[model samples]
Target chain A: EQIVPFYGKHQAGITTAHQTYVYFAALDVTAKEKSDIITLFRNWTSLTQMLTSGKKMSAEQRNQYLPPQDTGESADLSPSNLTVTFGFGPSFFEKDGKDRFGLKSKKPKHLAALPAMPNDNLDEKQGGGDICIQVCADDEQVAFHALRNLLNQAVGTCEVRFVNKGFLSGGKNGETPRNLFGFKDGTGNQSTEDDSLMNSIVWVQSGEPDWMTGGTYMAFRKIKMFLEIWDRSSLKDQEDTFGRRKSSGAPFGQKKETDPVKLNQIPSNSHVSLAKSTGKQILRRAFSYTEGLDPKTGYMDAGLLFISFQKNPDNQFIPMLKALSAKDALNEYTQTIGSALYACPGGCKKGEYIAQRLLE
Target chain B: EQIVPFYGKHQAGITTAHQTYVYFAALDVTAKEKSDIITLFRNWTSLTQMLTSGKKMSAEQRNQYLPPQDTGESADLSPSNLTVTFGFGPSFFEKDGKDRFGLKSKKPKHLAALPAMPNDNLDEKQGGGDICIQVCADDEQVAFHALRNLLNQAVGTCEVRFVNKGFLSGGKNGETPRNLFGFKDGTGNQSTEDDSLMNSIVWVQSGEPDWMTGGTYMAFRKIKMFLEIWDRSSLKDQEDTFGRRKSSGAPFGQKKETDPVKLNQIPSNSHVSLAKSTGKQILRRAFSYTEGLDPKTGYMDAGLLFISFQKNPDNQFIPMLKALSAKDALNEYTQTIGSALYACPGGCKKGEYIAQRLLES
Candidate 1:
C-alpha cells in the first residue's frame, strides 16, 4: 500500500516504515582488484533501481532460445514498497591489516568490527561479510524475489555467507509489533520525519570520511529466544525482567504505555533502565522470525532478527550494548548468536552507483 | 476478505475459492488406542470450528501464568477464508497388517496405500503420514499461525513428519494461478457449486464402505520443476509440452481458455491430451512454492505443491496419472519428488468426532 521513493537522501529502508517481511544476506567479495568491485556495483545499481519501481530486472527480449531475462516469479506482483539498502562491512576496506581493495586509508574510524561482548554466543558462520544488502517489502515474495535476483547476479563475484528471512505481524493500525516474548518492541524508535533528531542521532557529521558524509552505521544481531524456559516463568518475574508491563508495555510504575519511565522505581538490572542509561538512542527496525522446530527440543526455533541504525556505533550502540550485557535481567532468557556491523553509505544520485565516492 | 463455512458436507478447502497462501503438514500420530485418537479429533474439531469462524481457538484467559490461550500472532487478523482439512493415511488403520486402532476391518477398500507409479521419484521422508492437515488462508501469517497452534495442540499425540509452505499470486479477480513454469494451472478443475457434479466426482458413493460413503480420497504431489532447463526451451516447445497456449491457457488450436480441446491438433505425447484421455475428472487445487536456493547448482529450488481431490483414486487419478507417465512430454522438465494418498472422512455432526462411525462400530 505504500510506495517509498526508491531514490532518496539516505536509502529508503532505514527511515521508511517497518514492512511486514525482510530478507537479509551477507556476502564476501572474491574479486582481487578494486575495479572489478566497481563493475559489479554498477550492474547492481541498474538492476536494483528497476526492481524497486515495479519493473523487471531486465527487458523481456523476443529471442526464445535464451533464458528469460527476469526470473518471472514476481512478474505479476507489485513492488509493495520494496527497498534495497547496501552496506560495506569492516573487511571491505582492509583484511588482516592488508589493503585488499586499495582503500585501507579511507576506511572510516567508526567502521571497525564489533568486539566480543559479554553473554555473546556468536556463530562465526552466521555473521561478518565484505558486503551486505538489506531487503524489505510489504510482500514476502516481493522481498524474496529481490534477494534471489541480486544473489543471481553475484554468482562468481561474491558468495553468500548467510541469509535470514523474517516477518513481523501486522500490528493494530500500523503500530509497533511485539516480539516473540510477548512484549512491545521498538516503542522508543526515532521518527524519520523529524529531520533534526535524525541529523543528530543517525546521520554522519562533517568530520567523517567524504565518501560517507550522509551515511550511518548499522548493527544486526540474531538474538535467539529460549521460549521454553521463558514460557514457564511467572508473569510478575517476566515483567520485572523487562521492567515493563507485559500487557501494556508501560514502565513498571506507570499506568499507561506512554507514561514517562520512572527509572528509580524499576530494578537497576532491568533491561529498559540499563539501555536508557546509556544516553544514546538508536532507531530499531527489528522483526520476529520462526525458522522451524528445533531438532533437539521439538520446540519452535523462533526469535528476533534485530536491526538498528546509529550515526556512530562507538558513541551509541557499543556503549549501550555493553550496559545491557553487564546486568540486563532479560539476558537470562536470550542469547546473541550472530553479530555484524556495516557502514551504510549515503544514497546515490540518479545515475551513480551506491558508495561511488569510495572507489575514487 | 472472504470467509468460508467451516461446517459442511465436505471440507471447506475442497470447495472454497483458492486462498493466497497454504501451509500443509503431514503428521505421524503416536496414540496407542482408538479412544485417544477420538479424543484428539474432538479437541481439534472444536478448535478448528472456532478458528475458521474468525474467532480465537480458546478464550483469552485472565490468568497470566498460562501461555496465552491463543498464540496472539493472529490476534489482529481476520479469518481470511481460513480452512483446515484433515485426512487419514492408510497406515492409520493397519501398520504391518496389525490393527493398531481396531479399525482394520472398517478400512475402506479404496483407502489402500498407492502403488508405486512409473516415473515416481518419491522421497520416503517427504511423503506419507498417519495424519495430514491442509491449512489455507489469504494471509501467510494467518495460515502459519493456525498450523503452529494445531501442531502445538498435537504435541503428545502426533508429531510433524514434513511441512511444505506454498503461495499463489493474487489472481486477477480470483482466477487460476500460473505455476512457476509460466502456465495457468488447474484450468480444468470441477466447480464445487455444481452440486450434481461435485457429488459424482468429489464425494464417495454408496458402493464404498458404509463408514466412507461421505468421505473422499485426496492425493498430494510435491512436483519439482527444473526451471533452468525449461526457461531455455523455445516458447513453441513449451506450449507444445502442455498442449495449450502459454499466455491464454487454451487447448491446442483453440483461442479461449475454456474452448474445447482439439485432440487432433495436439501431439499424442502432450500432457493435456493424455490427462483428459481417461474421461475422468478431479478437483485440482495447487499452489506454487519456493524453498531457498539450491546451494550446489545455485538455482532456485522452486516448484508446485499439487493437491487434488476425487471420489475414487482407482477409477480416476490412477488411470489419468498412468496415462501421463507413459509419454507426457512435460516429464522431461519435472519430477514428482513426493507423493501421498489419504482418506478424507466426511464432516462430523454437532458433538461428534470425525470418522466416529468406524471407531465405534
Candidate 2:
C-alpha cells in the first residue's frame, strides 16, 4: 500500500480505506486575512499531494549556511498509502461573535461547534480549532513526517492546538479491530465498497453549500475509557456492554461477526442495540490511543479517538450519540473528554486547490 | 520475524536482532519478603515463556461469572519476534540503606545505582525502579498485550513506575535506523555475528557474583532530543554533530557506511569520534521515542531511548558516556531526563525459572 490519489472527486482520507495509523491535529490559525489563509491552503495542497505520492517536501538545497528544506527523516520511506484531509471548524469562519473571515456568511447553517453534550468534560485546549488536518497512513512515521512538514511550512499561519496519535488493529486484512477495552470496534461500519451506501451515509449530496457538494461533516470525540473499571467486570457484562461477543465480535447471541445485527436479541441499552434503534447511520473512522497515564488517577490514559463522517451530523451523528450516551451500558465505562466538529470541503482537481471553490 | 527463542543460554532480547518496536516499563516491587519476590519470578517465567512462544497467558475460563484469564486482545496475533527480558535494579536488592530482600549480600558490587554524572536532570520517579521489563516485538500490540497480562497477574506485587513507547526505522534489513534528529544511529557497534566479541563485551565475567555469570548490566537513558533546535541548524553542523552524512549515513569524509571510522576526519568532540576514543565497547540497543509534545516547551518531546548492555559499566559503559556527555557535540541538542541501571540475570532452562540460581543459591 503506497499511495492514494490526492486529486479526486472528494478529499482522499474521508472515504479512503481506513489506515493503520492517523495523526490528527486541531490547529488555530493566526492568518488575519482570507488571502493568507488561502495561500496557506494552497501551499498545503501541493505538499499534501507530494507527500501522498512519496515525494520529499522540497529539493535539498545543499547550501551549508541554511537549514535543510526537508527534515530528511522520511527519506527512503514509502508513502504507505497516505492521504491528507482538511476541515474547517466554526472558528475558521467566525470567532468571538465577529466574522474572522468573510467566509462566515458562506458557512453551512449547521457548521458550528457541536452543541454541548451532557457529561462533556471538555478540555480548554481541545475544542473549536480554526482548522483540522487528518493524515492517515499504514506507517506511523510517514503520517507524522507528512504532518510535521505540513505544519512547519505553515508555521506563522497556524499552531497546533490538539495533536493526537492513533492506531487500529493493524495485523491482517478483514479482521475487525479491537478497542483498548478488548472488544471489536467498527464492526458495524458501512462497507466502503458500496458506492451508493457511502454516497448516502458519508458523502454530502445536494447540500446547501456548493463548496461542500461532495464533502462531509466530521464529528470527533476523544473518549477516555476507564479500562480498569471495565476490566473488573465479568466477561458476560463486558460483552453485554457492547452487545458483541468478545471472542468473535458477533452480535449478541450470534456466532460470527458477519452475522447481521438482530436488535431484539441485544439489550435495549447495549451500545450496538441503542445505536441501531436511533435509525441513523454514520461512518466510523476511529482509532485507539494509549498515551501513558492520566496524571490525576495514575491510570492508563487509553481510549478511543471516536470519529464519524456524514452528510449532516444534525440528523446522523447527533441522533446516534444521543441514544448511546444517554442509555448505552458502555457509557458507564467511557467519557467524552474532547469534542469538536468540522465541515470538510470537497476535494479538488489537479489544477484547483483545496477549498478552492469556496475561496474563489 | 515470527518467533525468537525464549529459551537460550543467555536471555533473549539482549543481542537478539532488534525489533521494530519496544515497550519498556520500569516497575516498583511491593513484595515483603524474598519468597514473595521469588514466587513472582516463577510466575513471570512461565508467562514470559508462553507469550514469547505465541501462546496466550492461560486458557479462557469461559465462565461469565469471572474476569477472563487473558485480555483476549492478542488472541490470534503472531509472536512477531517477541522477546521479554527482565532486570533487577539496585533497589530490588536494597533501598533506603536497608536490605529489603535479604539478597543485598548477593548483589554484585557494581550493581548499585550508577553514580551520578554531571548535568543529570533525572526525574525523581524515573530513576531506580526495583525491577524493569523490556518487551520488544515487531508488533506493538503483541508487546503491549504480553506486558499488560504480565503486570496484571503480578498486580499486588509490582506496579508500573515508568512506561515508554519506542519505535525504529523499520523498513528493509541492514539499514541503520535514524534517531529523532534524522541521523543514522547505532552505526558503529559490534556485529551480532561475532560470538567472541559478544561474550567479551556483553556477558558478565568471573569477577561477578556466581549467579551473574552469563548475565549483563543494562544502562538506560531517556534522552529528549531538541528536534526543533536541531532542525534549525545547517546541514553541515548537524552532520558534524554526529559526524555522518544524512543522505547515506556514511562516516565523516567517507562515502560508504562500511568504511572504517577515521577518527581524525571527525571532530574530536563529535558523537562518534569521542566514543571511539574511549577504547570501550557497549552493545547499543537504542530506539527512538515520540510521545507527542514537551508541555514545558510545546515542542516535540521525542528522542532516543538509549539502551546498552555491557559486561561492566565501570570499564566500558560509564567511560563512553562520560566522554560523550562532557564534550560530544551532540550533547548540546539532547538532555538525559531519565536514567536507570539494571542487572539482567542469565537465561533459564525449561524446568528452571528466571533467577532461580540467585534465589536458591
Candidate 3:
C-alpha cells in the first residue's frame, strides 16, 4: 500500500481507494511553447516515479554550496500510500483567445470550462487553471512534500493559482468517511470493482479521440457549508434536507445505508432525490476542510472539497447539478464558492510522459 | 490512552506529555459579574468530566426537536487522549482599565499583558483575550469538537477573539517532534519526570496567591517562518544557525543529540547559544502549522505555535527572547506575529470549580 503503480491503463487516483489526506493544487502553465510543455511533463514523469518509489528526491550527492537537490522534510517519512494524478485544463490546449500549444484541435470533447452556477458565487481566482495535480496520501506531510517538490521543479513553468489542503475521517476499514457535517458522505458511490460501470460512466470512448480513450472529465467544486447554522437546525430537518438518516446514512425510511432508494419516501426537493431523479451517475471523491475563520462573519470557514469523475460533464455533471440547483433543500445551507473542470488524459507506459499521446 | 484523568493537583496539559493535535482558543469573557463567571466555570468543569470520559455530551436522551444536545461530529470517535486546560489572561482581571469581575485584587503579581517586542508585528486582535483554552488530543476532530461544544454553551457569555489550530509531527514514542524547518525541535527541553526541576522552573511558589499555588505561567507565541528562503540555504549554514546537526540532531561538534552544550564551540549568535547564555530554561510545547498561502506574496503562511510553561516570563521568557531578538540567526528567516501571556490556576477536586477559592471569597 506504500506506492501505487505509476504506469497503468488509466490514472491511479480516479478509481483508487481514497487516502486519508489530499493536497489539491491548481496552477497556471508558464511554459511558452509546445517544446517547453513537453519538457515539463517529461521532468514531472521522471520525478513522479522517484517520488512514489518512497526514495529520496535526488539519489546522487550534490554540491554543498548549492541548495540540496531534494528538500528533506519527508526524509524520515514513509510513502504513506502516495498517488499523484495529473490533469490539463482547457487553457492547456488554447489560451488568451489563441492556441498557444498548437494542440487546440486535440482538445477533448468535454474540456470546456465550467459554467456559472445559478445559486452559488464562484471565485474565478480560485477556479480554472492550466494544470492541476491531485496528490493523495495517508499522511498530510507526505502529500505536501509531493506538492512542494513538484512545484519547485516547475518553478519557471507554472504559477500558483490556488491550493486546497483537505483531509478525510477514518474510513480504512471500508467504512464510509464522514464530513464536517457529521453525516456519512459518498455512500451511494459506485464500487471501484465495477469495471463495466466505470468504463461506461467514467472513461471516454476509444473511437472519439485516441488521446482521450481512457481519459475522464473531472468536476471539481468547493462548497462552504453553513455549519453554525446547520448545527442549530433540528436533526429531523437536517435528515430531511439530505433525504438520509443521520445515524445510519440510509434512505429516509430505510434501516441500512445500502438499502435501495425509494424516491417516494423522501422529500422530492432533497439532495439525494434530485440526484436519483436524473438517473445519471458519477464517481464522488470528496474531502472535508476546516479553515480558521471567515473574517467577514466571525464564523468558521469550513466546507467540503467535492470531486467527481465522469466521461462528460454535459451528460452527468451538468444535468445532475441543474436538478439540485433548482430546489435542492441542502442548497439552503451550502454555497459553491469555486468551480473547475479539467480533462485528464489516459495513463502512460513506462517510457512515455503523461498526455504524450495528445501532444506527440 | 483514550482519556487523560480530569482530577489532579495541577492541570493535565502543562506537564501531561504532548498530543498530536491542538486547538487553542482565546475568548473574551462577556460576563459582567464574578458570580456569572463562576457559573461559566462550573458549567465547563462539569462538561470537561464528561468530555474526557469519552461519553456522550449528555447521557440521557434529548428532546428530538431541539438541536441534538451534543453535536454528533465526534460521536463514533474515541477520546484520543483528550485534555482540556484553562487559563485567564491579564484582561480577565482588569479590562479597558476597569475591573469587570471585581476580583482584580486577587490577580497574581506576575500577571501582566506581554510588552511589545523589538522586531515583530503582533496583531492585537489575535494576541490577547480574557480567557484561553488549550485543548489537546490525538485527533483534530476531537479537539475541534470540544471547542465547538464549549463555545456553543457560552454563547451569550463569551465571544471568540481568535483561535489557532495546530499539529505536531509523530513523536508518540518519546521522540522529539520535528518542525516544518525539518529539524528536531524541543530536543533540549527539560525532562517532564524531573519533579524538582519542574517545581523550581515551572510551578508557582506556595507563598504566592493560594489559587495559583500549583499553576504555571503560559508564554504563547505565533511565529512565521520563511520556509522557502530557509530551504534554499546550505546545510552547513543551517546547522550553524541552529547549533545542531540536521540528521542526528546532535550538538554542533558532538556525536550524540544528548551531548552537553559547549557554548564556545557553536556560533554565539545561534538560537541555542542565545538561550543557553541566559542560564535559564522553559518548557516548550510547540506545534507546526501550515496554512495555505499569503495572498499578497504567494508564500506559505506557515509557522510554529510556540508554547511554553514557566513560573514567570520576566525571568525566563522575556530575557531568553530579548537575547534572540538582538542576534539570533533564526530571526533573519522568522518573524513574530502573535503573543499572549495567561495565568492558569491549580486543578480542582470533584465538587470544587476552577479557582473556586478565589471566587467564593
Q: lDDT per prediction?
A: 0.80, 0.82, 0.82
lDDT of 2 by residue, A1-360 (tens): 477999988999887888878888888888788888889989999888888986665546658878887777677568889989999898888889888778865787678788776767888576668888998987777787888888787777877787887887654546777777777777787888889999999887785688998899989999998877877788888888878788778897677998989998988888888898888999999988878656677666778888889888999888887777667798788888988999998888998899998787
Compute the lDDT for candidate 3.
0.82
**Ranking of predictions according to DockQ:** 2, 3, 1
Chain B structural similarity (TM-score) per candidate: 0.96, 0.96, 0.97
Q: Candidate 1, which segments miss by more than 4 Å at Cα?
A: A56-60, A95-98, A117-121, A226-241, A265-270, A325-333, B56-60, B117-121, B172-175, B209-214, B226-241, B250-253, B261-274, B295-299, B323-333, B358-361
True contacts kept of each: 0.18, 0.45, 0.40
| DockQ for every prediction shown | 0.33, 0.58, 0.49
What is the per-residue lDDT of model 3 for residues A1-360, given as tens digits with 9 covering 90 to 100?
Answer: 477887888877889888878889888887787887788889888888788877665454355566666666676677877888888899887888989888988888878888666887998877889998999987776777788888777777888788887877664246687777778888888887799988988988764468787889888899998888988988777888889877678898888999988999999998999998999999989888778768876877888899999997898999998899869898878999988899988887889998899879
At residue B281, give the lDDT of candidate 2: 91
**Residue range B27-48, candidate 3, lDDT tens digits:** 8987777888888889888888
Model 2 CAPRI rating: medium
lDDT (10s digit) by residue, model 1, range A1-360: 356776667777887878878888898988888888888888788888888986654544476555555555566667888999889899998878778988887788788878998999998867888998899987776777788778767777887787887777666466457676767777777677799998888888776787787788889998988766676676766778888876667898788877878889898899989998887899888887666555666666667889999998898999988999979888888889889999988887887888888987
Clashing pairs in 2: none
DockQ of 3: 0.49
